[model samples]
Target: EGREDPQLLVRVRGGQLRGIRLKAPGGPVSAFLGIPFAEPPVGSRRFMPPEPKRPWSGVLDATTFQNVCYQYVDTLYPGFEGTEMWNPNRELSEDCLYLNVWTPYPRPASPTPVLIWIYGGGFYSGAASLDVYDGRFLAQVEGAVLVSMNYRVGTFGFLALPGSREAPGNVGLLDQRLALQWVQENIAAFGGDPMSVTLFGESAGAASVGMHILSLPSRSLFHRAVLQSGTPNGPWATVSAGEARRRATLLARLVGCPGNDTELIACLRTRPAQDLVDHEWHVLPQESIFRFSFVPVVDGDFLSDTPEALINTGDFQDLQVLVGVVKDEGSYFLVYGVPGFSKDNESLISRAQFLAGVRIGVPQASDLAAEAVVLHYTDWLHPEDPTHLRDAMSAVVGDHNVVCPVAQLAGRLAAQGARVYAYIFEHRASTLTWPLWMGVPHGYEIEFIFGLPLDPSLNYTTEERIFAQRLMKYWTNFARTGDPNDPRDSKSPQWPPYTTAAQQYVSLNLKPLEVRRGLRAQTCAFWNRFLPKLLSA
Candidate 1:
């Protein structure tokens, strides 16, 4: 409980609704948590756009946390700080359609800007209802209404069924669209200004947010967008419909269901959920870079085309965009995939994959491309020191999947006379656990951005806390005004608008480092020339 309940507060009219009372800086704030934005995506309705949850007969308890989206039963890719601690969240189901909200100003007529967050997990895992994503700080401390929620994952969300053209793929995207629709229609009662909405996410979440901008359905759903370490429109990352169908077929076969539509649906509906996860995922082999099998797919309707192709083709021409990526991106994969031994490349496949990325992206002469990368690092990596390899490889992965695409995206947007802000996160503070020597990899910045850590088991410090505060301030500022750069808060440097002559970015570190240049990598050169680029695969 935070303060006296506000009079004339907006009440939700759905399953298990309640309100929250937050205690923060100035005073107490009340909000509604764990509210349903969509009907449960369970059983027969699995793999479909969420249905509307039925309105309840009376006020329901929306104040407490609810069951999150179902996840793998094993090795849920523990983040950088605790690869070992990443135990799979065993409970998963098609019934995974749920969302959460945080409103500091719960009174009627409150028009606080809204911030919507999408979680990261290679697009196959993670949830908004998790304890770490608690919007309390953003709601009360930053004075914004925050919303996070769950959608289908793995097959449930992204899989493209063969012979099922009636429905577009990318059900997850549809779920997000549905959630935004729900907010637009009902958020007013919850003290949220639907018109002033900002969508932000990290990793896959970042990509999801970015993709929304390009979506025809997402127009006006949000005014501003932020992509952190991921961009949905980046090619070489998101799988196309054709690729998705193939992958979907493989996944269905693994679950012992018929690969095609009718049989696949019937088989899955009757199969025991545990049998699919336990037998299919195995979870013990430890692929060593991270094992995510699903992500957003091109459904003819929900996602008409590949995000990269669509974004560059004049999509999202009017949307305000703020996007950035880390310098050492490969480290995340290295830490997640490999155990303590520290060999980053799982097979020739990783190298081949890198090469494919470069050829498709930069299409530089093979020798020139190789030389370009050699200047920074080498193909002959030193496994003994995973730290050095981690840094160089991370940069490559970052560029190939995220950084380069983001810069390209900004460039494309700027071509249309639109302002696009970009950044490079180069800060690291060691709390890294497995593959001990790796620098700050994926999820590392989460601690700083959200002021959170996996747990005490992962190393963290006081300076990191300060870094976290700055990040929170920047994010909140952007959520409010569509720019992470603080202009009026003279406490920091001037945030220059990114332009052709100056594609500058605010370097995130122990101290502010002005990124005067953009990133270039060979693996990414191949990717940009060819894998879809990110801001990852």
Candidate 2:
């Protein structure tokens, strides 16, 4: 054992660099952290698309994490820290366009597949350095190179204004694209097959993956995508340029930069990043109505058109795709915002008002349409009684917000002959402490999918551990082979490609997952097809 140690050095387009070498469960591994993929979007470059980083002169040390993007500490949610799956690092800066790479077999004879993760924070707050997003486990278990990148968030990332080169929208997304380009240019040095890279994320990150699929420039960077509980057509996903510009103008005014013109951008940029983070105005008023704010804008260059419109034209890249949703996707949101949870606030009139109050892009829809929704979900139950009324309310909102839209996306993609796999994760841990009704809430699937301990405090059952093991197998299998089914497991059923006729999807649960047909068949038909037609009439 007299072998001299490898320096863990790799040369890239920009410069030579060294990383931390360590042992992983799979074997030897290396983590290259906080390597700049783009020039810092600071000073005059603020609000602009990312530019390639200037080459460094000497070996760069990529051992420690860099600064997280500028974001205000999220204090809106009362019980958020206790339940949030991610623990976001408390550091902020404008120069946050960096990426991390972890490869299990650093000098493999053949390169391994790559999985690039985009963290979700509603386009307001998130960082790749979050403790919950450690990539070692996934890299070790799946034998795939794992990559994560940090991009600007809040007003600094998505602010769009008319005129000038600096204030164009979708800069955060451009940050992601540049990171992928860096991976394409350099991942091979770290034993990663850049050609086989898979881009995947949850919530807003998933919506971003959908946007990247629809946009031409971003489409070629990755070959496969996994969308978890978010889609382009979701109400919160896209904002009109007019809305974005209006919001930008408002934020400028708040930050002591007057004028609604391009010059205002310079003045706004001069302000401290913290000031902008503090006064990050909701771009579209409609977003605040639903707590979805400061999101991607439908700029002509980056976004071109709404994702729904783009998907309808069927011009998107036809990459192998896996899309799934947690069983109670909206229960987490409803935990804090569930309307009329109290007995004093409950009334049939209140329920009617709530049903009638559903808004689409700042306009109130017809009462008849709202009544139809109420009639569909409420069945024959009286709404006046508040005894567990939140359960049904969360269901309606969840369907409207995430479930039906995703199901619609599956249907549309299948109708267009794309090889897409749809799934519903319904497994709930036996020792789950969240109230009984909040079944398999949003983000619960992350732990199982990553093959980590289900929760820090809970005693995870043997069945759950087995389930997590198999789930990871399915996910990593998809990343490796573009198919989740292991012909190896002759007993495990094949995961069929979704289609309009069959509407097939895998039902993931504890004791052996199964194939299920037509998720929310009637509800989706109502929301995506029949209800719209009826409302228009």
Candidate 3:
């Protein structure tokens, strides 16, 4: 009689990778970390599209994470220790085009669905090596292969020159596209179904998924998508090519590399990568908080048109889509990122301050439109009160930046007859370090979706564990099939398909999951319907 452990070795296209087996609740998981999808984008390769990794002869160790793409880490503000949770623990470097995979141990009876994760940090700062993104738990629990990749950010990623072939824009997105291509070719070696791939992400990552849906090159790479709390239609998500060129030139001047397009890009390649990352922020407006310095642009090649125009013309992929936002998406930005909008001072914000916030958040809006926004968001019951005004401002930020845009995208996709499901994550985790008033702020749903509660190292309650499991099941179920609800099981509430007419969405929470209609109907109408017309006028 003999007992044997499953093979920890996998043979991908580039080379043979030696992954590690980790123990889990359901079964052991095969975790392959730091697999290089592309050659290092260093030296002359800097700011250029990623080249696929060359094949290696020997077995490659895929047990440890590689260096993260360069980014500036912020010092934690008092009482905001939670901010550090997403920062990379690994070293930083330009050679960061690596991806990690976790699959069911002993190779699922058959090839399972693939769920690829794109980390979001406004396209400026993020890493695939963060602890919260570990795919082991989710892989075992959901019976799916989970993948996350590192892409260049900030100056290194989005620096665009109109006619320069060396530094075309959106190299960051190109990095992601290369990683998806790697998956299409190699995920089957790790027991994943390449044909059933789902691209899912949060914040800028979600916006990246949206751009991929709209772009020509990314077509048919994935069959499903899940956008959490962001869409390409959001004002801050993308910029025009001219705006991108301006930002790139400004960044060159700031970094002491000012010159013509060719000379500027050449000079930029020689400068220290950290210096480029450090100085790129100077390109943004003084009032910028939510706006990113370098983001995806309509580069004519990568992106043919604006996201709205692309969607309106039915140029985007018709796939099973799930998109949603957290309850108070802006609270995280206000409490942590904004200078004076801390939890203690939120109630003391003046009407003038609220108006300024609106202008800064939606800089493209006309003066009349801005005033209309002020009037619409005003709490009639407590008109002049500072506390009410603060609440109103928060609603405006959340609605305009995330909630309303998400609804618009979902509605437009549904109108095209694509199967779409929408959601609103309303459950606040009990273990959050921030004040309870933040109310399920941006990125809080990530932990639960990744099955962090199953770790037992953190302080997740029993109820939270159950909720996390249910949420994971829903996410993986969607990845497995088009529908989130299991066709054979009635344990969870049925998530209705989103449509322009019905406008239905599920309210995701701990217990008694319910489906609701017309998510922020009037608020979305103002942002999606009225505001655009007003801006044009």
Candidate 4:
């Protein structure tokens, strides 16, 4: 099935070199594994956008996962523990920038379509090398070249220090831009149509895809985009270095480091990355307790302004977008036992007590727009058992961070007049989701995307395998032609184009992912109309 003589090597625009294996279907398809799109950002180059890699000599064996960009073990998430996941990359360092390619025709003498994937893990963790990101199926099946690349995460990827102004912020975003630039200039060599590239991602990755959709620096990088979970300008989006520094000072105090600006940064630069990643802060670090807060920032240059705000000002590229979110969106919060959705009273009490007093005011507006959140968040948190409390907390955090933002993006994008197809992931994978058992929790769609259910072993039945195939086909179709409905036009329900449905969104459950009515409108009313503005007061 898989062979070795069809390999080829090439130097990118700036001499960055890579060896690639071409996988052609029947012949198993052409693929070019790990190839550096940029120079390793280690040593003196640390904390900067990836520069092009130094060209090398003969073909290097390009078969392994390049040490991944900075991230934590996947086991931290419940249900994610037992898989054969990686702990960390072997050649880990600041010089971790790299790219991987899976092409249908490595050298067919024609330009094929290209799809670039940017992995997500909040702002602190995740890598393109993870098995969950297996692009092989999508590549061979779609007959298009698939690309996934690594960008700096944590302080290394998004941190904006004082002296770093000239360097710009969102180094991670820059790394993505650099990778795409590399593809635009060289993917043709690998049989990819430079002008037909599309960008895709989830959570942070989704957010980055949105960035490219709107950035001049990243302009023309890709032709289409798909965003899942998170969006640009989200509350959880990476903040500027100044904001980070302010938070860093507090974190420095927590971790027993110098709080002085210079002292704080120096301490951070040398601190053990793991020590920085400690504590199960769920989806936050550096800014909270778990994530190092290394998210991309709106540097006024690369990002310009809040994504929504920028749209309001008519400052974004008019492009087609297949954006959506998962149902029980906030259900992921259960993993950390935060509160509102739980049985115990911890998460609830903390909100009543620990939540900024302004929160109460924000959700207290007339008609009680934000009332549902208060009720959903604090009302049922304390159920006597700690487990209940954990579930409740997850719900509260999940809504505040994931669900609401996705809704906001859907609405905002539609208003901007973009061709937006918003769908929600609700496929129940038999077992309950992580941390909360909330059906079809975070990343549940990955199983279908990777076609994992094809095998009877990992709990996937024959039907599940079929469903997975359909799902991947849907996504790859979108990647190739910028339309999910196009893929299904000749198949199942012609995935009706989104309108107000764009506002409410459709959900992807065990059955066909159909358009749901009024959920988003109800939720938006609860968030925007009912939800109160605590800070303005």
Candidate 5:
């Protein structure tokens, strides 16, 4: 009865599982999908910390992926088509604490290092089942096991109400924590080395990785972390506890659940999950469309203090980390402002929105300081250049959202004696239809990192293939040891650890790859030196 073809049967803490096996390029690999890590958070368990998954009798069939976490699906990404890699394309539900695993040799003579991928959707939406996240190729090529887990997102994941278990905040993060615990206990069954597990993510996922690094509960869970274009220090990564409560109260009232905190939470849990999601859409008044209301908060237990305070005071896991950003990371957001950029060079409206965005960043800064920021990033030299304003805005936006935050975090960690390595992704994805103004847009690294093909319309070139291979080698090597320099492989480039003195980082592009120290020197100087001073005042 247990001998299904592609026949792979494995047992873990919860129950017996049967998975599918595939013949990959490097070798054969096994994939187990839609395995639950926790009991369904429904009925009385809604809005509560995840409970241990109940045991089952017969061999559980894990052939198909589970439904993605419930989230508002009314999004339209600018230039992508149906079923793009980043967006969720599956059933949606509240019972979504599931994870998938892939291994080259499920019962190898020696266990392999594990890479746990956490997806990013501004902390609102994503799933482990996306076709783009298929780990078979990476598992075979890199000789490692890969894991991706789904945690709650948006209002379902991040809503916080202090002083009660009815709707405590950070429950979503706890969902991820329990998943790690499950891995620690059961990954060896999948031929993964528990001690060598490396946590990595992009955007909100990257931010979640940083939070885990800072969080006390997760310090010993993962050994190393790789942050891709996000950190806990980003502008939208966190909200104050007081602000969280205020927002919760507001949501309660908006949903016609007016009463005491207990009554409010009880009313919320009883409402239809979609009703909460639909009503929560405009929760935060968008000063700019970029703002998000539901995100991790400074819950005293998990996050203890502000991320900046914790990192500055040497309160994080003293582990090796590799963190970096993409070239033109802000181009994704700037594309939404194409209409504004299409205006006349001296258009007051375009300039006004830029200043307004600056205010959103540093709300208390003096008008003079804000104006100074405009002058600093604006192109006063050549007003004739049509793309001049857009280019300038892109640089500032990139620095604000990614460059400055990453640099600031790197400097802090380096000063505290953590072995940190940084990199700048300079390679562009295959597609000539890209906007002339955009560089390597945000989230472009996923295809290469996940070992997937770039743009089907354009034939994959030989150069990009080599680049993706080099990246996979560097990433998997780091997951194996703490350094990207492969222990046995001599052909790979040596990636130096980042330090406060050198500020070195590897630049990944088509030309012969090499290290470039001090990324965005002048812009970082302005952000690091002047912006802090302005904000403090």
Candidate 6:
């Protein structure tokens, strides 16, 4: 039978795996799904660092995807129509520390570069098994091995009990780190070069990639990184140790486990995991849709210092890196996550509403700093026009959350002599059902990165297909040699590395990819430079 086919079998450190053969656009592909990288974090191991998975005797069936990490799936929002694509469709469980791998069928002749993907759901909810993250196309066409893993999220992954041994925070990050160790130790069996690994992700996943760059313990796991739409120093990325502990204490009380650190850890573990996730909102205000309850903490062990301090002191790995953001990164939050805005609404924003939006966007800023932010984004020529006000609001949120943080990180990395390429994705797919004004919203560029447009079943036009093909070449080329430009493809436009002097980046769109300078220079300066001083003053 085909079960005995040598192409579908692989032997790693843990055990033997029998994968499935898939017919992809470029060629045949071998996919190993549901391979456990760590022992299930359940019962006594809950809220603790993951333990490596033990070896198995015989062949393990890795033909199907495993359970995703437990979390409440919210789909009642207005933008669920578009966002529903990313929601977890499988069963949820605490025993979900699995990873998947895809390689060109029959394996490559020599070791190929590896691309590891970490998904993002604001660090509260995400899964590697999401359809949008499937690796068959990327692995087969790009000549690189693709790997993605399931990591714990929400209260289960990040309950910081600072003094206690039972609950060290950032277990989710530990899950990612353990997965990387697995790749380093076992990827050769799947025909991948461990030394040529590139860690890349979007949103919280992107933040995780940046965090790994800054983390002392995780610096050697990968040689290159690509951060899309998020970074470790983003305003919403990481919380102070005091803030993390405060939230942990509040969550414990809300779940009826108020006590000392040890007792709190023991008592919370006894409660249902879903109950903790259900009560996560009680830890914050009702208007905190943009905020996450439990996220990565600056624990002294995993993250020794603040991301800014680490970057400033050159305490991070100086690997080749590519960082970018979509043009309308904040539109998704405004149209979907925010309570007052919707896809159908076109009404003008009132002055009071605009001020309230500013407050919500930057809650920690003082009144004076908030006013300065308002003044900086305001269009003086049409100060009273509500239409312009809406645009300004989007800019403020996007710059604060993703755009400026990405620019800041890229500039800092370049200054430290790291090879860096920066970009801004401005293409809006034709298959989207969103309103025209939404533009290219958050997570839109993922499809192109995965070569979804190359799929004949989708409704992509000829232009989009060509664009996605070129994007795949660029991404895979970088994974192969740390340079995005394919020397073989003479017709492809050259993407210049980012530098502090010119602040150059590629404006990714259809046809002629334009090389541009100073991405949101003035706006980013206000956020990265003036705003910090304004707040301190």
Task: Output the number of the lDDT-best candidate.
Answer: 6
Task: Give one digit per residue, the lDDT tens place, for model 3 in 1-537.
Answer: 024334777788887888888877667888999999999999999988899999988879888999999877766563355887877689988888899999988778689899999988999889988877889888888788999999998877888886588888989999999999999999988888999999999999999999999887787699899999999887898888888888888888888886457788899899998898788778875565678888998888878888888877773345899899998987777754443477554345777778887787666677899899998988878777887776777788889899988988998888877899999998888888777666788899998999988877788999999989988988999998888887887755688899888999988888667889998998898988888888777
For each candidate, give its TM-score against the true structure: 0.82, 0.90, 0.96, 0.82, 0.92, 0.97
Question: What is the alpha-carbon lDDT for the whole of candidate 5?
Answer: 0.78
**Which regions in candidate 2 have their CA more than 4 angstroms from the true location?**
1-7, 22-28, 76-87, 281-283, 286-291, 315-317, 335-368, 382-388, 429-434, 454-459, 530-537
2 against 6, candidate with superior lDDT: 6
Local accuracy of candidate 2 as per-residue lDDT tens digits, 112-186: 888999887778878888755667767766677889999877877888784557788788889989998998989
Instruction: State how far residue 352 of model 1 sits from its true place (Å).
Output: 14
Worst 10 residues of 5 by lDDT: 341-350
Query: Judged by TM-score, which candidate is best?
Result: 6
Kindly give the stretch of ten consecutive residues in candidate 2 with the minimal lDDT sum. Answer: 340-349
Query: Could you give me the TM-score of model 1 versus the true structure?
Result: 0.82
Stronger candidate by TM-score (5 vs 6) = 6
- Which 10-residue window in model 3 sums to the lowest lDDT? 1-10
lDDT of 4 by residue, 1-537 (tens): 135443355445544334544332234555556677787776445555677777776555566777766555655543454223434545555567878877664455677778888887776777787766777667666666789988887767765553443234577888888898889888877778998888888878888887787677787788788887767755567565576555545555556666234545566656665555552232233223212355766667777776767755653236677877676555553333322333122333344332432132232233333444555445454534444444454455555566666667666666667667777786777643343346555666765765656545566666677777777776777777767765435656666555554344566656775666544455456554444453244
Question: What is the C-alpha local distance difference test score of each model?
Answer: 0.63, 0.75, 0.85, 0.62, 0.78, 0.86
Cα lDDT of model 3 overall? 0.85
How do the residues 1-537 of candidate 5 rate in per-residue lDDT, one tens digit apiece?
635653388899989998888766556778888899989987667778888789899988887799899887744554454225567778899989888998875546588899999888887788888766778878878877899999998888887787677878888888889989989999999889999999999888888999999997798899999999998885678888888888887887788888367777888888888877877755674444344667888878789988888889974346889999998876666444434542113322356556665665444347877776777877777643545655666677777778888998888888887889999998887742346557687777877887665323436587877777778878898898888887876665677888888999988787755888886777787877776677665
Query: lDDT of model 3 at residue 75?
Result: 66
Q: Is candidate 1 or candidate 5 better by TM-score?
A: 5
Q: How far is candidate 6 from the true structure (C-alpha RMSD, Å)?
A: 1.7
1 or 6, greater by TM-score: 6
Query: How much lDDT does candidate 1 score?
Result: 0.63
Candidate 3 is scored at a TM of 0.96
**TM-score between model 4 and native:** 0.82
